Amino acid sequence: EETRKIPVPANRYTPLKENWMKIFTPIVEHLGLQIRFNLKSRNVEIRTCKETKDVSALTKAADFVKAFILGFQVEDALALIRLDDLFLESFEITDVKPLKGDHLSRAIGRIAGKGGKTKFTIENVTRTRIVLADVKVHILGSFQNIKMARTAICNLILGNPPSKVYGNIRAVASRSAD
Amino acid sequence: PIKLARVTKVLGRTGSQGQCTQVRVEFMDDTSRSIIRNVKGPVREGDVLTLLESEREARRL
Amino acid sequence: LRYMSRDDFRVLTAVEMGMKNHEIVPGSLIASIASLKHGGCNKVLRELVKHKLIAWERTKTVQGYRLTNAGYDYLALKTLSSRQVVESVGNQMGVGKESDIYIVANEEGQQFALKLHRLGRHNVSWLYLSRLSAMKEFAYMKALYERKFPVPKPIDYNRHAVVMELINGYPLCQIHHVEDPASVYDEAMELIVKLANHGLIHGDFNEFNLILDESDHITMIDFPQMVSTSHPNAEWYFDRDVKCIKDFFMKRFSYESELFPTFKDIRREDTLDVESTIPPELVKQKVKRQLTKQQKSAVRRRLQKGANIFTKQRRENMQNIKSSL
Amino acid sequence: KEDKRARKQAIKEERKERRVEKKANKLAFKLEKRRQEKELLNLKKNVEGLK
RNA sequence: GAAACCAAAGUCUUUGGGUUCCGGGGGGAGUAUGGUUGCAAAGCUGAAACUUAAAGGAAUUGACGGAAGGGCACCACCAGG
């Protein structure tokens, strides 16, 4: 039998304590995997057992808990267990453009939008879920949809105002057999 | 090979003009194999279909 | 008719510049892009509205002018007059649904046929769709004439106008009898195979798109509907056109076919389905271009103050208020 | 050395020839704009009318 | 306080704590010319003639979005007569 452990940072502990029953239940019910949380090592330790139905169910679980730890909502992350092709392509915000201080803060700002509107609008059009950790952009969706989303997010951080960005991406969505 | 079908649930209307009905298909081959298919015409819950190809699966995701 | 032949060119072309970018073009913009004469263009516009050249629009805030159906027609004929193709007007006119046929005569006196596209969404889009129609039709007209086809000869295209060779006759739909039905049938059947050889299917090859010249020669017109042979239903549109002619000659002239052409030949012919260093002379030109742009920008802002309609509405209510007090 | 040093000194001489040539054009356009400014302002005062 | 805003941008027609620089409708123009500094590129200082009823700052409704979501119509479509 084999195992995979994934870390959890201190800012993500209290959600992992709250949502714990919503996390371990789908891991243990229809996947049939042993799961515990090592408080010493601060890792979610998941295992195979005798009750494990199939191989790669371990990998389904690994991706699920990873998604939750990155910041994705449990209901959204659950999709990784059921669906085949969903990926979390993540990149630093400073990968696209070298930005310092106040410029980076405005940069984060316009990915999000006022009331998080821009963030949600891309999530709608690209059929993805995006998460902004302070200086990281984690996106979750289909591969074609990720490559779409990474471009819109990217344009926003290298300047292009939200108004131009929506116009570009809605044309791209129309061609991709959506 | 020709396989007969059931209707488990009528989901919604697909198609350009709203002509196609998206329908949950149970098999009459005893298997609980639930494949979602698109039908042309009027289909109510409890209909029995004649699918030409059973290997096909309609627009999921 | 065309009497005025100076300022009318510049003003009407200036409308066409604004028509490509925006809907209704304001009178402020017109004079700036027609800088040759200043001030006296507003009386020219009042002469243009006398004819069906331009239409006035004062809805709520939008104040200006848009080009009409007939006004767009005059612009092409004015360009064809400078190319020495059109001089006088022939009166034999076949008014259709998609296009109008006008007889034109040159300097020589030789009569030619002119096609004017009348597509009839706002009128701005309708006069842009007619532009793409003529450029597409002239493209096929050049492509077929060069490749031995019995089509009218392409001469010149201007925006929506197409000048063609004058083939005078009657359409196949209004023909009672043909002296030799068999020879005409075999001629028409060859032309479907001819197009298929060049990788083309007519699509709507009927009796409504064929003209006989003295009951000897079959002439083909109207080409915006043509499709490629790479299409999945290539043989279907091929067979439908064959059966349309097969039945027609059996219906009208009572001729039964002995030859049944159903050959797929792609492609033995051309694929037509695709169809100190800087000299002072330069310094002068560059300085001139800078100085004109500074003057043109200032004239725009002077013309933008024309609002005259806003001042007229405000004055009417003030007279009513003072009298009632 | 001598190979790189001569190659760099050739590019220095190209740029020195270049900004002399750029300054010469900057005075040529400045002298031509100023005389065309007068010849346009001349029309405003006189030689513009009807009769 | 025109105001967004500002515990300073407050203690201003109930106007004076000391003190330096600096703006006077917009352009022309931060241009010419002179001086000076600079190897150069340039920097500092720095006009006029002439032209123009405006150039602008704050706030506010939303005619129009080639913006997005809904909803409806055989004077729309779909399956048809």
Tab-separated table of C-alpha atoms in Angstrom, chain C residues 100-267:
chain	number	residue	atom	x	y	z
C	100	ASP	CA	-31.429	47.190	-61.472
C	101	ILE	CA	-30.315	46.961	-65.117
C	102	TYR	CA	-29.503	50.303	-66.772
C	103	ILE	CA	-28.414	50.763	-70.410
C	104	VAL	CA	-25.342	53.016	-70.718
C	105	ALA	CA	-23.625	54.614	-73.730
C	106	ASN	CA	-19.983	55.729	-74.031
C	107	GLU	CA	-18.196	58.424	-76.101
C	108	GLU	CA	-18.220	56.070	-79.139
C	109	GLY	CA	-22.001	55.505	-78.994
C	110	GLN	CA	-21.618	51.781	-78.245
C	111	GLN	CA	-24.330	50.577	-75.843
C	112	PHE	CA	-23.305	48.620	-72.730
C	113	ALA	CA	-25.241	47.158	-69.788
C	114	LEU	CA	-24.868	48.444	-66.210
C	115	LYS	CA	-25.871	46.594	-63.037
C	116	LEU	CA	-26.743	48.514	-59.861
C	117	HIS	CA	-27.150	46.563	-56.613
C	118	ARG	CA	-30.246	47.498	-54.597
C	119	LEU	CA	-30.127	45.431	-51.394
C	120	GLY	CA	-33.044	46.294	-49.075
C	121	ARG	CA	-31.046	46.849	-40.257
C	122	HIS	CA	-30.199	50.502	-41.006
C	123	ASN	CA	-29.581	51.905	-44.528
C	124	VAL	CA	-25.838	52.252	-43.699
C	125	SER	CA	-25.465	48.440	-43.536
C	126	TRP	CA	-27.629	47.984	-46.682
C	127	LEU	CA	-25.334	50.274	-48.721
C	128	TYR	CA	-22.282	48.359	-47.421
C	129	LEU	CA	-23.694	44.923	-48.360
C	130	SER	CA	-24.187	46.180	-51.936
C	131	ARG	CA	-20.460	47.047	-52.034
C	132	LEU	CA	-19.385	43.457	-51.264
C	133	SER	CA	-21.932	42.017	-53.747
C	134	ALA	CA	-20.534	43.812	-56.823
C	135	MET	CA	-16.899	43.019	-55.944
C	136	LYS	CA	-17.826	39.323	-55.617
C	137	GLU	CA	-19.850	39.290	-58.871
C	138	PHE	CA	-17.091	41.020	-60.879
C	139	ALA	CA	-14.577	38.481	-59.508
C	140	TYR	CA	-16.572	35.563	-60.975
C	141	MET	CA	-17.292	37.513	-64.199
C	142	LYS	CA	-13.542	37.934	-64.825
C	143	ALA	CA	-12.805	34.314	-63.820
C	144	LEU	CA	-15.330	32.760	-66.241
C	145	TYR	CA	-14.693	35.020	-69.281
C	146	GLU	CA	-10.963	34.188	-69.194
C	147	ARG	CA	-11.774	30.448	-69.035
C	148	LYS	CA	-13.877	30.216	-72.273
C	149	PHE	CA	-17.351	30.532	-70.617
C	150	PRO	CA	-20.262	32.270	-72.453
C	151	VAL	CA	-20.659	35.132	-69.927
C	152	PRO	CA	-20.988	38.951	-70.356
C	153	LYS	CA	-17.595	40.681	-70.653
C	154	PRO	CA	-16.423	42.497	-67.471
C	155	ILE	CA	-15.434	46.152	-68.072
C	156	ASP	CA	-15.301	48.187	-64.809
C	157	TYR	CA	-16.471	48.095	-61.172
C	158	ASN	CA	-17.228	51.110	-58.944
C	159	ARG	CA	-18.511	50.512	-55.384
C	160	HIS	CA	-21.777	48.771	-56.395
C	161	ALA	CA	-21.848	49.314	-60.190
C	162	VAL	CA	-20.779	46.620	-62.704
C	163	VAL	CA	-20.385	47.356	-66.438
C	164	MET	CA	-20.951	44.333	-68.699
C	165	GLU	CA	-21.272	43.412	-72.402
C	166	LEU	CA	-24.720	44.081	-73.881
C	167	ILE	CA	-26.244	40.680	-74.680
C	168	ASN	CA	-29.852	41.399	-75.665
C	169	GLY	CA	-32.462	38.629	-75.575
C	170	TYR	CA	-35.218	36.969	-73.557
C	171	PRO	CA	-34.977	34.847	-70.356
C	172	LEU	CA	-35.677	31.106	-70.730
C	173	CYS	CA	-38.804	31.264	-68.507
C	174	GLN	CA	-40.726	33.338	-71.114
C	175	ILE	CA	-39.857	31.287	-74.237
C	176	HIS	CA	-42.668	29.606	-76.187
C	177	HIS	CA	-40.742	27.678	-78.888
C	178	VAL	CA	-37.140	26.996	-79.951
C	179	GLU	CA	-36.352	26.109	-83.598
C	180	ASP	CA	-33.714	23.536	-82.554
C	181	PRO	CA	-34.490	22.142	-79.041
C	182	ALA	CA	-31.858	19.354	-79.132
C	183	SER	CA	-28.844	21.589	-79.942
C	184	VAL	CA	-29.843	24.096	-77.235
C	185	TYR	CA	-30.281	21.264	-74.690
C	186	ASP	CA	-26.811	19.795	-75.405
C	187	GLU	CA	-25.266	23.289	-75.166
C	188	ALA	CA	-26.777	23.839	-71.687
C	189	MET	CA	-25.838	20.352	-70.413
C	190	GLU	CA	-22.218	20.958	-71.485
C	191	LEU	CA	-22.051	24.149	-69.365
C	192	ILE	CA	-22.903	22.281	-66.131
C	193	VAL	CA	-20.091	19.775	-66.874
C	194	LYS	CA	-17.845	22.742	-67.826
C	195	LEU	CA	-18.386	24.407	-64.416
C	196	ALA	CA	-17.877	21.079	-62.588
C	197	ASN	CA	-14.592	20.654	-64.515
C	198	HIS	CA	-13.445	24.049	-63.149
C	199	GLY	CA	-14.588	22.921	-59.668
C	200	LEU	CA	-17.840	24.898	-59.472
C	201	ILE	CA	-21.523	24.155	-58.880
C	202	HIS	CA	-24.065	26.859	-59.819
C	203	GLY	CA	-26.527	25.862	-57.061
C	204	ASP	CA	-29.556	27.570	-58.613
C	205	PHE	CA	-29.123	26.651	-62.289
C	206	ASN	CA	-32.719	27.160	-63.428
C	207	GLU	CA	-34.727	28.650	-66.318
C	208	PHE	CA	-34.824	31.925	-64.327
C	209	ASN	CA	-31.051	32.502	-64.664
C	210	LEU	CA	-30.590	31.759	-68.394
C	211	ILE	CA	-31.008	34.123	-71.371
C	212	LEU	CA	-31.182	33.091	-75.041
C	213	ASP	CA	-29.484	35.229	-77.698
C	214	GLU	CA	-31.609	34.894	-80.894
C	215	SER	CA	-32.511	31.294	-79.804
C	216	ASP	CA	-28.926	30.162	-80.592
C	217	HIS	CA	-26.672	31.090	-77.671
C	218	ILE	CA	-27.224	30.567	-73.924
C	219	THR	CA	-26.005	33.396	-71.654
C	220	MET	CA	-25.366	33.066	-67.899
C	221	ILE	CA	-25.822	35.893	-65.343
C	222	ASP	CA	-26.127	36.353	-61.508
C	223	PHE	CA	-23.171	34.891	-59.571
C	224	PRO	CA	-23.217	35.394	-55.781
C	225	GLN	CA	-24.578	31.918	-54.866
C	226	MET	CA	-21.738	29.732	-56.250
C	227	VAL	CA	-20.218	26.954	-54.104
C	228	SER	CA	-17.092	24.751	-54.039
C	229	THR	CA	-16.968	21.069	-55.116
C	230	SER	CA	-15.179	20.328	-51.797
C	231	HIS	CA	-18.678	20.556	-50.228
C	232	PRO	CA	-20.059	17.221	-48.818
C	233	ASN	CA	-23.284	17.512	-50.877
C	234	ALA	CA	-21.447	18.296	-54.151
C	235	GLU	CA	-23.264	15.684	-56.267
C	236	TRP	CA	-26.690	16.672	-54.833
C	237	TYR	CA	-26.569	20.260	-56.126
C	238	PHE	CA	-25.117	18.856	-59.373
C	239	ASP	CA	-28.008	16.392	-59.911
C	240	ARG	CA	-30.731	18.883	-58.901
C	241	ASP	CA	-29.620	21.314	-61.645
C	242	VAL	CA	-29.517	18.470	-64.201
C	243	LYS	CA	-33.074	17.334	-63.314
C	244	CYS	CA	-34.288	20.963	-63.475
C	245	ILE	CA	-33.204	21.211	-67.138
C	246	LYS	CA	-34.231	17.589	-67.961
C	247	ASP	CA	-37.837	18.234	-66.875
C	248	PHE	CA	-38.088	21.765	-68.354
C	249	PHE	CA	-37.391	20.784	-71.987
C	250	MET	CA	-39.793	17.850	-71.588
C	251	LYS	CA	-42.388	20.269	-70.115
C	252	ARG	CA	-42.103	23.328	-72.388
C	253	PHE	CA	-40.689	21.956	-75.673
C	254	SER	CA	-41.581	18.237	-75.253
C	255	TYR	CA	-37.994	17.078	-75.832
C	256	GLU	CA	-36.900	13.834	-74.165
C	257	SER	CA	-33.180	13.401	-73.504
C	258	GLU	CA	-31.016	10.770	-75.203
C	259	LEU	CA	-27.806	11.804	-73.383
C	260	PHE	CA	-27.618	11.645	-69.569
C	261	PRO	CA	-24.444	13.444	-68.346
C	262	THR	CA	-23.523	12.506	-64.751
C	263	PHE	CA	-19.719	12.798	-64.676
C	264	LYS	CA	-17.637	13.906	-61.702
C	265	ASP	CA	-14.429	15.501	-63.012
C	266	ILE	CA	-12.432	17.367	-60.325
C	267	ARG	CA	-10.189	18.964	-61.327
